[PDB]
């Protein structure tokens, strides 16, 4: 299986503490060493060290001695990564990786758990419609989109018609505004003939604030 269950995204202010977990499937836990590699925004991977899942011995990379601590939960086939006295520099995605002794390979990488360190607060987004041409309702395929802006932190999920729409749909990378809030757009290419007959509603979600809106275009 090699299946790894990572814990959810974390938002915290400087000086606090986080503890990320990673549950390894059964019959996988003691067949690998659990490694932690950091990947800061737009930066390369950095090995933080690893923990022995058989003896429980943690080995820390020198660039990670002090605030980081690896621990285990044997009965739960779970490994923990803790960072105390958090700072902006810790903002990154932390990967839980299973590695094999003899080949020294990072065999299986987990989904990664993001950690955002900011003294800002969560802000739900507003969903404005991107009307499919205000005077052009005919012409093969039309406009059609959804603008979700001024939220924090990332990410937001956007699907069209509850997952019904997957064709032409193009959700864009968030962009950080001068306000410190995020903004992004999700557009869908559809046939001008569908306008009128077919209903179009983009469903947005911002779990960091429990926001879950839908907007008819």
């Amino acid at each position: 299986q090699v299946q790894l269950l990572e814990s959810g995204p974390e938002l915290k202010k400087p000086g606090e503490t986080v503890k990320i977990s990673c549950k390894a499937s059964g019959y996988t836990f003691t067949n690998y060493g659990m490694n932690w590699v950091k990947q800061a925004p737009g930066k390369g991977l950095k090995w933080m060290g690893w923990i022995n899942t058989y003896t429980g011995e943690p080995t820390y990379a020198d660039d990670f001695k002090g605030r980081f601590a690896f621990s285990l939960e044997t009965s739960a086939s779970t490994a923990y990564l803790q960072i105390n006295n958090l700072k902006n520099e810790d903002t990154a995605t932390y990967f839980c990786v299973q590695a094999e002794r003899l080949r020294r390979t990072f065999d299986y990488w987990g989904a990664g758990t993001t950690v955002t360190v900011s003294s800002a607060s969560t802000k739900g987004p507003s969903v404005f419609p991107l009307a499919p041409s205000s005077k052009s309702t005919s012409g093969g395929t039309a406009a059609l989109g959804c603008l979700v802006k001024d939220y924090f932190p990332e990410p937001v999920t956007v699907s069209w018609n509850s997952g019904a729409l997957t064709s032409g749909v193009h959700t864009f990378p968030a962009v950080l505004q001068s306000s410190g809030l995020y903004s992004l757009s999700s557009v869908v290419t559809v046939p001008s003939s569908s306008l009128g007959t077919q209903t179009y509603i983009c469903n947005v979600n911002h779990k960091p604030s429990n926001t879950k809106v839908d907007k008819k275009v």
């Binding site: 991977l45 390979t105 990072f106 404005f128 419609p129 991107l130 603008l147 290419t189």
Partner: protein, 217 residues
């Protein structure tokens, strides 16, 4: 510090063509035990890395034979014979011979395909958004190639500057094209002091800079 240096940071290549990525380390990766722990990983879009080749030339389980690696000491090479769309992602080498394992900066494989002009659409701010104090004008460049595309905003016919941000999707895994979105933001106040709002797009796939604009304002 042990640095891994991947020469081509960006590697455009035509479907079916061969691609070659080089990784050069500051220290020999040959271990005192005769082993050379140089691995190659692929990190596809919106995904965690997967191991491809281990210990220089060994294909990992599930890895097509189009992938192969070579090299010794401090010079290594990974080769993708007959590139496919499935190959899109970032390729990075990893050394595990010395102290803390380290990784290379990465190489983004891009699929070369015939030039394709974008379809440009423009969306005026929403009422709900307006009635809240700010105006967001969105200009969309759908399905184009190559990536390089310029978008200039003109209001009252004046080249706007500093009040727009853009985001471009990852190379589509079906047509190999990109998609861009540009947002010009003003205050309901400033949005009123003018009438014509246009976005002048200029792409290689266009004989002359195309522009789209909306009436009111």
């Amino acid at each position: 510090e042990l640095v891994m240096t991947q020469t081509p940071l960006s590697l455009p290549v035509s479907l079916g063509d061969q691609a070659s990525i080089s990784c050069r380390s500051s220290q020999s990766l040959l271990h005192s035990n005769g082993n050379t722990y140089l691995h190659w990983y692929l990190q596809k879009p919106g995904q965690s890395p997967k191991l491809l080749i281990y210990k220089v030339s060994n294909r990992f389980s599930g890895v097509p034979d189009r992938f192969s690696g070579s090299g010794s000491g401090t010079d290594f090479t990974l080769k993708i014979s007959r590139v496919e769309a499935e190959d899109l992602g970032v390729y990075f080498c990893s050394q595990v011979t010395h102290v803390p394992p380290t990784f290379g900066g990465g190489t983004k494989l891009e699929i070369k395909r015939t030039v394709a002009a974008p379809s440009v659409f423009i969306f005026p701010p929403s009422d709900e958004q307006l009635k809240s104090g700010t105006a967001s004008v969105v200009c969309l460049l759908n399905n184009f190639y190559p990536r390089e595309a310029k978008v200039q905003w003109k209001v009252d016919n004046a080249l706007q500057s500093g009040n727009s941000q853009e985001s471009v999707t990852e190379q589509d895994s079906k047509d190999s094209t990109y998609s861009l979105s540009s947002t010009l933001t003003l205050s309901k106040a400033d949005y009123e002091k003018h009438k014509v709002y246009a976005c002048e797009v200029t792409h290689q796939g266009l004989s002359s800079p195309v522009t789209k604009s909306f009436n009111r304002g």
